């Protein structure tokens, strides 16, 4: 309760400064003996590429999901910016110091630089391989070895760095183009930014989610929030006629007595040393958050009504609920304006729907009275766009802002109907109250000014493009307080503290940034989620996290519904270049990763026909085919899903040349023997007994009579006759020279969070402030 949504709000710091150290790679080169055709180890040994972590699954599906997590890890580690002075390392060799990039880089060199390799050209290169700085442009040249796929990564990380410059001018510019402009306030800074500055652009695009169309439930929660936020600002008022004094002259001016009541119920309204401040705050926030309030009055508290007219003249009515403006107006129309304006006859009969206030317009005649009606009735909000960047602000009719000829007119109309009558007395109590508005009018003129400004000020600070809808939790406001605020003010002038204002900006800011950001985080995922065919990662998942990261919301305490509809809208959104640009990268090569690396394969072919084996250098000559040219196929993923249509069962039974595809467990064997016995024709049996298969551990034959104690056969003369080889590309080799890449980045940066702070915001003397009319706000003494 109350200060329970504020501590959750003030306590929001999405401004994390993401950065990195380790150059993100995936494959470290490794050893392994060389097998020259004929199957002998020729020594020296060559260098190939395998992956750090062969995690890869069992089943195409589990595979795809796996990668997915990579995406999430990539984003959480997503390097916001980058710098290399912090990446230094040393080269054991070279024309000198060497200072290169990332431990791994180092290791490798020293390593190859010992195990007698291709000789010269390598040692040589490693040598005159250094760094150098082009100081002038603040540029940096650091050498580094990676792998086509690695350069790929880290590269874009450099060509992207979301860190724009930072000059005095930009600081000045992020201070709303309507406040620096506002006179009454003054800026001022204590330092001069270096050419070395930078800043993170907290992006704040609009409600890419039209969260007001049908979702009411949540808007209400927002408004609420934005509202409390507001009160936390709305300047606490200053010095106003001591409670007692006023209320005492109050009893006087009216003339009271003994069991002779008339106006006596108009002062359970005093308490304003509380009410005025509440009524004041409450009113603004309402506007800002653009929340809708209710109305608690009496029908015997006429005064309380009069002041209503004050209110009404102001807030465009649409700002209050329907069932409330209805009551109010008719209450006025029926017990306030007819019953002393010899207009009764029909105490006004009403039946709901249409506009019970309005109708009073085309009703009786009198000009003063008549203008009020049109001005109040058809008075709305002015829908205004841009405000020094898409603010999408709702403003109050220029007219009203201090050029309050409305108040003066609201009074003149009151001064003129206090003429005719009907029930003899009654008028006494009624008009007496009316006059208390008149005298005070000199001051009432003020109140208007106040709000006028304040709302009109605070405003700018909102980046949360507020709109105009019906709330639902409806904040409550009594005519009690209203009335107090009214006759109880003047001579005073109050205004938004500097520090206060910023704080306001800052918050909405963050918040925005978070919304926008998570949005991107969200989208990115879902889209990836589709071009993955994960018809099994039920999305009730993403939405949840999303909302959560936006505190305030009782996640568990909100249905599965709205949630889905939420996806439906997200799905139709683009991705932030950053996000997107990376996924394209992951996919594009995806294949290459998978296929390489052990612990898996791809698929197996069963040609009931003897056949040769490739002689690749890595392994001796074994069971492989990077092409599977011909034969039919059968997705396993679509198998253990389809429930196997004995299609496979039949083909296996009848022995027909065929193949399989997907995630698979390889199994290495040696002792030639196994081969001649044609062992690999086994395994396949299983299946028949078990519709589903994973129990399928396919066969491979790493064979080089060098390491295979059973060489006896390489002897005679020969050629490897197998039945059924394996789909699995082969780990590219390692051409160091070209396997390296070069890097650029910057030197001695300087990141800054928050900003603003750099200003001793001071204020003029209250007694002479100004509004959008260049006039002294508060001049009546």
């Amino acid at each position: 309760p109350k200060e329970s949504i504020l501590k959750k709000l003030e306590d929001i710091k999405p401004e994390q400064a993401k950065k990195q150290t380790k150059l993100f790679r995936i494959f470290e080169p490794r050893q392994l003996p060389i097998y020259r055709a004929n199957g002998e180890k020729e020594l020296r040994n060559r260098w190939y590429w395998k992956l750090k972590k062969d995690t890869l699954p069992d089943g195409d599906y589990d595979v795809r999901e796996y990668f997915l997590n990579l995406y999430d890890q990539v984003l959480t580690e997503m390097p916001d910016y980058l710098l290399l002075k912090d990446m230094a390392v040393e080269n054991k060799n070279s024309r000198d110091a060497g200072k290169v990039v990332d431990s791994e880089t180092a290791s490798i060199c020293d390593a190859i630089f010992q195990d007698e390799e291709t000789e010269g050209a390598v040692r040589r290169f490693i040598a005159e391989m250094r760094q150098r700085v082009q100081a002038d442009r603040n540029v940096v040249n650091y050498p580094s070895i990676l792998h086509p796929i690695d350069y790929a990564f880290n590269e874009y990380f450099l060509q992207h760095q979301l860190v724009e410059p930072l000059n005095n001018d930009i600081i000045f510019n992020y201070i709303p183009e309507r406040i620096r402009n506002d006179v009454n306030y003054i800026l001022n800074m204590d330092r001069n930014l270096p050419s070395t500055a930078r800043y993170i652009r907290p992006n704040l695009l609009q409600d890419r989610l039209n969260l007001h169309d049908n979702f009411e439930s949540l808007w209400d929660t927002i408004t609420t929030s934005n509202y409390i936020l507001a009160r936390s600002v709305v300047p606490d008022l200053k010095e106003l006629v001591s409670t007692e004094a006023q209320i005492q002259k109050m009893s006087q001016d009216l003339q009271l007595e003994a069991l002779t009541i008339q106006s006596e119920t108009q002062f359970l309204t005093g308490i304003n040393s509380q009410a005025a401040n509440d009524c004041f705050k409450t009113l603004i926030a309402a506007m800002l958050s653009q929340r809708t309030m209710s109305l608690d009055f009496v029908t015997t508290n006429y005064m309380s009504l009069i002041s209503g007219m004050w209110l009404l003249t102001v807030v465009p009515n649409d700002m209050f609920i329907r069932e409330s403006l209805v009551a109010c107006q008719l209450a006025i129309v029926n017990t306030i304006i007819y019953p002393a304006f010899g207009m009764q006859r029909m105490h006004y009969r009403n039946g709901d729907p249409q506009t019970p206030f309005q109708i009073a317009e085309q009703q009786i005649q009198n000009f003063q009275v008549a203008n009020w009606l049109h001005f109040v009735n058809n008075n709305q909000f002015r829908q205004v766009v841009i405000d020094g960047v898409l603010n999408q602000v709702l403003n109050d009719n220029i007219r009203n802002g201090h050029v309050i000829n409305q108040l003066m007119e609201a009074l003149m109309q009151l001064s003129r109907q206090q003429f005719p009558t009907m029930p003899v007395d009654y008028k006494r109590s009624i008009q007496r109250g009316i006059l208390l508005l008149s005298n005070r009018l000199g001051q009432l003129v003020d109140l208007t000014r106040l709000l006028a400004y304040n709302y009109e000020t605070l405003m700018a600070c909102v980046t949360m493009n507020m709109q105009h809808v019906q709330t639902l939790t409806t904040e409550k406001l009594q005519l009690t307080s209203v009335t107090s605020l009214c006759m109880l003010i003047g001579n005073a002038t109050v205004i938004p503290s500097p520090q206060t204002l910023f704080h306001y900006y800052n918050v909405n800011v963050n918040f925005h940034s978070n919304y926008n950001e998570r949005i991107n985080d969200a989208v990115a995922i879902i889209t990836a989620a589709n071009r993955l065919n994960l018809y099994q990662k039920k999305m009730k998942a993403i939405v949840e996290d999303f909302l959560k990261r936006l505190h305030i919301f009782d996640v568990a305490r909100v249905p599965d519904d709205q949630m889905y509809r939420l996806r439906d809208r997200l799905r139709l959104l683009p991705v932030e270049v950053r996000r997107l640009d990376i996924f394209n990268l992951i996919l594009m090569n995806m294949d290459q990763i998978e296929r390489a690396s052990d612990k898996i394969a791809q698929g197996v072919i069963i040609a009931y026909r003897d056949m040769q084996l490739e002689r690749d250098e890595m392994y001796g000559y074994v069971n492989i085919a990077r092409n599977l040219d011909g034969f039919q196929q059968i997705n396993l993923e679509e198998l253990m899903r389809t429930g196997d249509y004995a299609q496979i069962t039949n083909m296996l039974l009848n022995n027909q040349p065929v193949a399989l595809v997907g995630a698979l467990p390889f199994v290495t064997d040696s002792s030639v023997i196994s081969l001649i016995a044609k062992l690999d024709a086994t395994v396949f049996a299983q299946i028949v007994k078990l519709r589903k298969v994973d129990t399928l551990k396919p066969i491979l034959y790493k064979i080089n009579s060098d390491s295979n104690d059973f060489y006896l056969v390489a002897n005679y003369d020969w050629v490897p006759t197998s039945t059924t080889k394996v789909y699995k590309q082969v780990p590219q080799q390692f051409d160091f020279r070209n396997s390296m890449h070069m890097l650029t980045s910057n030197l001695t940066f300087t990141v800054y969070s928050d900003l603003l702070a750099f200003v001793s915001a001071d204020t003029v003397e209250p007694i002479n402030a100004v509004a959008f009319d260049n006039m002294r706000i508060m001049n009546e003494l």
């Binding site: 085309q362 008549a370 058809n378 009719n397």
Partner: protein, 133 residues
């Protein structure tokens, strides 16, 4: 086409019902209709003319709305309006004339000008009214 029509009874029932004096109520149902238009327009560009001794003029739209605020129209209200109508007048003229010259056999009936072919567009239909002519 039907579009075109409105654009006029709009102005006539306008340049006629809108003058120094009248009480709002005789035009509430009118003012509205009017504005609706302005909106749909603003932003779009038009090509009128380009044949014979016919001036080729371009037209941009960026105009305000109306003050439903006042009661009995004050002179000042009119003038700030007439000035906005006189662009539509001098416009429509240049519009009618442009499609009042082109002809075609096959599909002779339908609209021809780069001005009107864009009017039959869907995003405009939000304008029709009082077809008693």
């Amino acid at each position: 086409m039907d579009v075109l029509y409105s654009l006029s009874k709009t102005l006539k029932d306008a340049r006629d019902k809108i003058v120094e004096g009248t009480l709002y109520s005789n035009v509430s149902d009118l003012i509205q209709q009017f504005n609706q238009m302005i909106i749909t327009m603003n932003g779009n560009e038009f090509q009128t003319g380009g044949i014979g001794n016919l001036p080729i003029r371009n037209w941009n739209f960026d105009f305000g709305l109306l003050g439903t605020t006042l009661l009995n129209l004050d002179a000042n209200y009119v003038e700030t309006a007439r000035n906005t109508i006189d662009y539509f007048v001098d416009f429509v003229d240049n519009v009618c004339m442009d499609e009042m010259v082109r002809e075609s056999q096959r599909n002779g009936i339908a609209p021809q000008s780069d001005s009107l072919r864009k009017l039959s567009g869907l995003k405009f239909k939000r304008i029709n009214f009082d077809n008693s002519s």
